[PDB]
Amino acid sequence: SYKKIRSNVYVDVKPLSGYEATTCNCKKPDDDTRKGCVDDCLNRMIFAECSPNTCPCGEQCCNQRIQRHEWVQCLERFRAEEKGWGIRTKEPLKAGQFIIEYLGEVVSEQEFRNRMIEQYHNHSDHYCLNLDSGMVIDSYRMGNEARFINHSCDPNCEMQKWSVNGVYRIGLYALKDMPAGTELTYDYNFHSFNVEKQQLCKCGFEKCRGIIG
Ligand SMILES: C[S@@+](CC[C@H](N)C(=O)[O-])C[C@H]1O[C@@H](n2cnc3c(N)ncnc32)[C@H](O)[C@@H]1O
Numbered sequence: 001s002y003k004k005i006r007s008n009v010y011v012d013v014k015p016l017s018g019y020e021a022t023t024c025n026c027k028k029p030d031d032d033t034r035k036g037c038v039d040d041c042l043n044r045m046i047f048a049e050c051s052p053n054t055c056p057c058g059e060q061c062c063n064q065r066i067q068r069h070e071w072v073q074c075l076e077r078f079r080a081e082e083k084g085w086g087i088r089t090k091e092p093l094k095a096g097q098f099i100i101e102y103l104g105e106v107v108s109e110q111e112f113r114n115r116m117i118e119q120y121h122n123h124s125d126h127y128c129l130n131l132d133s134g135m136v137i138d139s140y141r142m143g144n145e146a147r148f149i150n151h152s153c154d155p156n157c158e159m160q161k162w163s164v165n166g167v168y169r170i171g172l173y174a175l176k177d178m179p180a181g182t183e184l185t186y187d188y189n190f191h192s193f194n195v196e197k198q199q200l201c202k203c204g205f206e207k208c209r210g211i212i213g
């Protein structure tokens with residue numbers, strides 16, 4: 001029962017990273033076929049996508065994934081046993097691959113708290129990641145499919161914080177290759193917000209830490 005958005009909705013804050021990542025220097029290819037910014041390009045080293053208007057690789061680069069909204073067209077929602085809904089791929093996924101950007105209403109730490117008691121009173125799930133400087137990305141009412149990814153103590157994905165054109169945004173990247181049909185997951189510990197609301201983890205894992213978060 002959420003509203004589908006294609007981009008973050010900035011409520012009362014601004015996640016300005018404060019660092020103008022420019023001149024990624026990594027050289028441009030030669031074949032339209034292949035890509036431009038290998039596993040290098042000085043920018044990707046400080047998790048800062050390249051500003052289109054300067055990247056040596058022109059329109060055919062690969063470190064602007066979050067900007068160009070280059071999400072994977074495979075994710076499929078589905079009923080996860082004792083975890084309600086969940087997301088999974090229909091196409092395999094090499095590791096380190098950009099999977100999708102995590103959207104929502106980016107709000108302050110206090111703006112969220114209020115929502116946490118003023119509206120998310122009688123609520124079961126927890127939809128929001130830590131963004132930066134207390135600012136949070138709330139997705140209880142708005143966001144995309146990522147809001148549907150479950151937690152695992154042995155994640156196959158990691159949420160990463162990148163400076164995009166001067167604004168911190170969060171993308172979901174794979175940690176390990178995955179066979180089609182595999183459910184995407186990430187560790188809510190260093191990413192998801194902090195509310196003493198707790199739940200038993202149906203992670204289904206050997207050394208599972210027992211509790212979410
Ligand atoms: C943002 S939602 C993920 C989508 C959700 N499964 C649904 O049906 O709408 C987060 C909630 O899903 C459930 N969940 C996600 N991962 C879980 C896990 N490993 N174990 C148990 N519950 C999980 C918990 O209620 C948690 O608060």
Ligand SMILES: [Zn+2]
Nearest residue numbers: 024025026041
């Ligand atoms: Zn570069």
Ligand SMILES: [Zn+2]
Nearest residue numbers: 050055061063
């Ligand atoms: Zn670039």
Ligand SMILES: [Zn+2]
Nearest residue numbers: 153201203208
């Ligand atoms: Zn677990």
